[PDB]
């Protein structure tokens, strides 16, 4: 909030054009690393409601439809363990905690009911 | 979005244009009450004075002096100043001020001012050349005249030596007129210098009584004790507004606060040392100044190949903030395109989940 | 007086600049390896020790 | 009046520890939950400060130094410890601070007062009303210039008491800043003997006086025909103050709940 | 003339320090592929090509 001061600023170049553009960079690699983590599979695999899985019991890793979110027992776990000012703007990212935690259903629900053929193919 | 890829031809995506930042509307600026404002109230409109051989010197403790009650009042006669102006008095700071208050003869007013000589001027009370400060006269024949003539109002008339600036005689010794040494006797060589003037009440101009009082500004190495009366205009509850709370600054957006100071903190600080939270000095409320909304204009758009609608988004700021149909999501306030309750693939990544396309009646969708 | 502290604030933000690039990219090199990992192990079985 | 008092019994000046005391409020910025790093002149913890003892005989309040302000606690009892006097000649030549607390009100009134050898208030004793009565004030005896002048609010203190341990305890913390005479002071009920207690305190602000003259030395004003007499039963601390950085921690509701001296050990560090 | 040598100083101390974030990043990078390179071909038997 200063007149003067942006007059004396924009005579020394484009450190501001600079400076944004490298931030800009920085916060689309941010979701495009989150993508190429989680998001290598298009196609939201569901566990079936038998849980039959030859005596083991994924009943601790896989959603619950009775908590308010779809996030597991560990996930919450782990959530849970960890806890707009003058030029500071954090960005929201692009593939919500939702998101995330449907990407790991499916690919959990993949290795379960497929072993490995859900990666390579159908 | 041309000028900032510095090309006609667009492609499909999302560009951060320019920034978007409101702009304050008011400058309110507050401070405390002005109450005890200064003894002025009773120094001026006195019983009695002192005469000018033996003027008084009343120092000015701590009070803010309202020079806007003396300069608007047409009540007295004459107001003059030396070195400043009389409409900055207000709006200055000062260490000491002293009030000489005396009583002299209407013809021998105008000998009372910085540079003068004469007879009263340098036998009674003398001015500096660097004096600054204000003169105020006013006429006093209605109360100070008497039937007869009034012989009570004595001033010293002849002195061996000039008198130093700001110097008050005490001694009252009888003047030697030639080289005969004065036994303490009237003669043909001594003479009594102390007499006293005669105010009448029907006398004109250049006989009445004028109170005439000098005001004395200096300062030196010592906290300043007299002041201006500081203004202080109307608060606004919620608006993005420059304030000044007892020499702060800034802007932002004030609200209802729920922090309990303490009765001796004014304003509060956050971490890393940001100002987060002042308190009214007259209301003695508390209220934070929360910053003004601001943030970046993205101007999500297809290829210009397929059309040229376009849609804003203002990330980070709130909807009612911004000033055609207008969505509100997780990332920022949407103008311009249509919220479906449908799913697609996402073909223009907006953030906090929602993705814009151009499909189906044909416009940009969210 | 805005000069310097133009200079100065520029400096800082520089040098905040320099070490977020630094640190994104490190954090790209750790999610490279965490997706490898996710395609390897999960998506398969690797042979690879350790 | 001006009295040299020499019926006094002869003590070596006796020292004591101060474990966590002098933390005041640097400023009057409000912090919630948040350790703030300050450096000003605070009391360094666990200092050795001198100790002064009036016993029964024992009146001991002569001139002490004034070098970058000087933390006073008084472990006070039956309102003995009423006033202080500063300056830095307190011959009448030079301007001087001097503050009064009598059974009326806390004049402070800054003049250049002539200070005699021993100044003191004295207070009569069961004068056929069986409630004690001040009627000495030999404090000063003139003053020509005067700068600045205060007088509060007049009020009515108890001048009687007797009890077999100190119940009251007042510190207070007096600076020089750019001519401000800063003045701190916290209150809070004790039950000791002849010790410090051993707590932490902070110390709030409660006036600040612009007497824009330097001070060198200060004196204490204790409570009582040139022999004869007996004082009562209080004590007073005086402790220097060093530029040194502490580590404050404000609560949820913007109160000092501790402080860590920067260079007193290594963990503190 | 102080305050000329302490910016120098301090421009030099920072473009040390980021010549020295570079190199240690560099050198993170190598250490991880060596402690890989130990743990698959020393520890076990790698089918990977070179
Ligand atoms: C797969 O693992 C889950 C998690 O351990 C098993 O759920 C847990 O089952 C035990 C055994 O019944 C529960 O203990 C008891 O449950 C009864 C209700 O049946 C409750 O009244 C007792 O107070 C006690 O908690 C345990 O609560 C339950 N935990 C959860 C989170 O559901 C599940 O049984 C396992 N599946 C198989 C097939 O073994
Ligand atoms: C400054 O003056 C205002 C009024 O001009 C004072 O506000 C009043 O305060 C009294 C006491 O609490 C209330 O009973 C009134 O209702 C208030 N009036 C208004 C219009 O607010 C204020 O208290 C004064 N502040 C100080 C520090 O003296
Ligand atoms: C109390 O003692 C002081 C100090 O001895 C006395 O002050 C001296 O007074 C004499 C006579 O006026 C002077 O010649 C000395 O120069 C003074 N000394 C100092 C250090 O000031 C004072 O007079 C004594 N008061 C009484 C009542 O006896
Ligand atoms: C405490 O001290 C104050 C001021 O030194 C005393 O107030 C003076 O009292 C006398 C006697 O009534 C008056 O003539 C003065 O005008 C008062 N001065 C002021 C400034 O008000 C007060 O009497 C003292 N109280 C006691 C108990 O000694
Ligand atoms: C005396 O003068 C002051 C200003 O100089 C004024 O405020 C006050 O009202 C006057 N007194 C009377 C009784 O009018
Ligand atoms: C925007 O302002 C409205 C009105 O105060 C409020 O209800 C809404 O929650 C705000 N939105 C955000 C994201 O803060
Ligand atoms: C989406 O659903 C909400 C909830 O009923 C409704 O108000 C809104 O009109 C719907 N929008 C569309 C485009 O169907
Ligand atoms: C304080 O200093 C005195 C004087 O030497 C000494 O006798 C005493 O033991 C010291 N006290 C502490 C706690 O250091
Ligand atoms: C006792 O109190 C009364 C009332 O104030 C007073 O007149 C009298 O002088 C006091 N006694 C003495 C000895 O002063
Ligand atoms: C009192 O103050 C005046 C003005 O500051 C000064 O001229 C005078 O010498 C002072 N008196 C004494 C005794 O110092
Ligand atoms: C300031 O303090 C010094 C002592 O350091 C003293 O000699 C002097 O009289 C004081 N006042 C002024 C105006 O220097
Ligand atoms: C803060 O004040 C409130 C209200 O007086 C009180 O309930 C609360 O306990 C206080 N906080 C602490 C830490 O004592």
């Known amino acids: 909030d200063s007149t003067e001061c942006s007059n004396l600023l924009l005579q020394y170049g484009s450190f501001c054009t600079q400076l944004n553009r490298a931030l800009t960079g920085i916060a689309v690699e941010q979701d495009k690393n989150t993508q190429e983590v989680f998001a290598q599979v298009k196609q939201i695999y569901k566990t079936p409601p038998i849980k039959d899985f030859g005596g083991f019991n994924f009943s601790q890793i896989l959603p619950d439809p009775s908590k308010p979110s779809k996030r597991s027992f560990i996930e919450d776990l782990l959530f849970n363990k960890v806890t707009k000012f003058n030029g500071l703007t954090v960005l929201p990212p692009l593939l919500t905690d939702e998101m995330i935690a449907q990407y790991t259903s499916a690919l959990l629900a993949g290795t379960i009911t497929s072993g490995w053929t859900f990666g390579a193919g159908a | ?366 | 007086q805005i000069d310097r502290l133009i200079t100065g604030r520029l400096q800082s933000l520089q040098t905040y600049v320099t070490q977020q690039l630094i640190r994104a990219a490190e954090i790209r090199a750790s999610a490279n390896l965490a997706a490898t990992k996710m395609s390897e192990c999960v998506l398969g079985q690797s042979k690879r020790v350790d | 009046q001006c009295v040299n008092l020499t019926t006094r019994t002869q003590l070596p000046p006796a020292y004591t520890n101060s474990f966590t005391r002098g933390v005041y409020y640097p400023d009057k910025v409000f912090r919630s939950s948040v350790l703030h790093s300050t450096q000003d002149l605070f009391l360094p913890f666990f200092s050795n400060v001198t100790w002064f003892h009036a016993i029964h005989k024992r009146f001991d309040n002569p001139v002490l130094p004034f070098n970058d302000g000087v933390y006073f606690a008084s472990t006070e009892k039956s309102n003995i410890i009423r006033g202080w006097i500063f300056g830095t000649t307190l011959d009448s030549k030079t301007q001087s601070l001097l503050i009064v607390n009598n059974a009326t009100n806390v004049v402070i009134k800054v003049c250049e007062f002539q200070f005699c050898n021993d100044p003191f208030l004295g207070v009569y004793y069961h004068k056929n009303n069986k409630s004690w009565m001040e009627s000495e004030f030999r404090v000063y005896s003139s003053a020509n210039n005067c700068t600045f002048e205060y007088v509060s609010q007049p009020f009515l203190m108890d001048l009687e008491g007797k009890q077999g341990n100190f119940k009251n305890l007042r510190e207070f913390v007096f600076k020089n800043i750019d001519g401000y005479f800063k003045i701190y002071s916290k209150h809070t009920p004790i039950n000791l003997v002849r010790d410090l207690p051993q707590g932490f305190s902070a110390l709030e602000p409660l006036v600040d006086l612009p007497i824009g003259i330097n001070i060198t030395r200060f004196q204490t004003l204790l409570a009582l025909s040139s022999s004869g007499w007996t004082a009562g039963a209080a004590a007073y601390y005086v402790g220097y103050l060093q530029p040194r950085t502490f580590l404050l921690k404000y609560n949820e509701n913007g109160t000092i709940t501790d402080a860590v001296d920067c260079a007193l050990d290594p963990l503190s560090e």
């Open chain 2, 1 to 366: 979005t041309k000028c900032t890829l510095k090309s006609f031809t667009v492609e499909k995506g999302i560009y951060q244009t320019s920034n978007f930042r409101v702009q304050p509307t008011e400058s309110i600026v507050r401070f405390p009450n002005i109450t005890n404002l200064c003894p002025f109230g009773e120094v001026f409109n006195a019983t009695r004075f002192a005469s000018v051989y033996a003027w008084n010197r009343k120092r000015i403790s701590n009070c803010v002096a309202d020079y806007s009650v003396l300069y608007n009042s047409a009540s007295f006669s004459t107001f003059k100043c030396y070195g400043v102006s009389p409409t900055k008095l207000n709006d200055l700071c000062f260490t000491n001020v002293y009030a000489d208050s005396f009583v002299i003869r209407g013809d021998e007013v105008r000998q009372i001012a910085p540079g003068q000589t004469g007879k009263i001027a340098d036998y009674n009370y003398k001015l500096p050349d660097d004096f600054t400060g204000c003169v105020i006269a006013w006429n006093s024949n209605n109360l100070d005249s008497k039937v007869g003539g009034n012989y009570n109002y004595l001033y010293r008339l002849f002195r061996k030596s000039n008198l130093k600036p700001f110097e008050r005689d005490i001694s009252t010794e009888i003047y030697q007129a030639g080289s005969t040494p004065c036994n303490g006797v009237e003669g043909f060589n001594c003479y009594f210098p102390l007499q006293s003037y005669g105010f009448q009440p029907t006398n004109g101009v250049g006989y009445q009584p004028y109170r005439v009082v000098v005001l004395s500004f200096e300062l030196l190495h010592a906290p300043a004790t007299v002041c201006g009366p500081k203004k202080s205009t109307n608060l606004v509850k919620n608006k993005c507004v420059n304030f000044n709370f007892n020499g702060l600054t800034g802007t932002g957006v004030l609200t209802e606060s729920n922090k309990k100071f303490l009765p001796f903190q004014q304003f509060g600080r956050d971490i890393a040392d940001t100002t987060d939270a002042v308190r009214d000095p007259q209301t003695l409320e508390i209220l934070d100044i929360t910053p003004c909304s601001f943030g970046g204009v993205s101007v999500i758009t297809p290829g210009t190949n397929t059309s040229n609608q376009v849609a804003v988004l203002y990330q980070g700021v709130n909807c009612t903030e911004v000033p055609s149909n207008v969505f509100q999501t997780r990332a920022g306030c949407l103008i311009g395109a249509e919220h479906v309750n449908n799913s697609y693939e996402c073909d223009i990544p907006i953030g906090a989940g929602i993705c814009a396309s151009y499909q189906t009646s044909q416009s940009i969708i969210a």
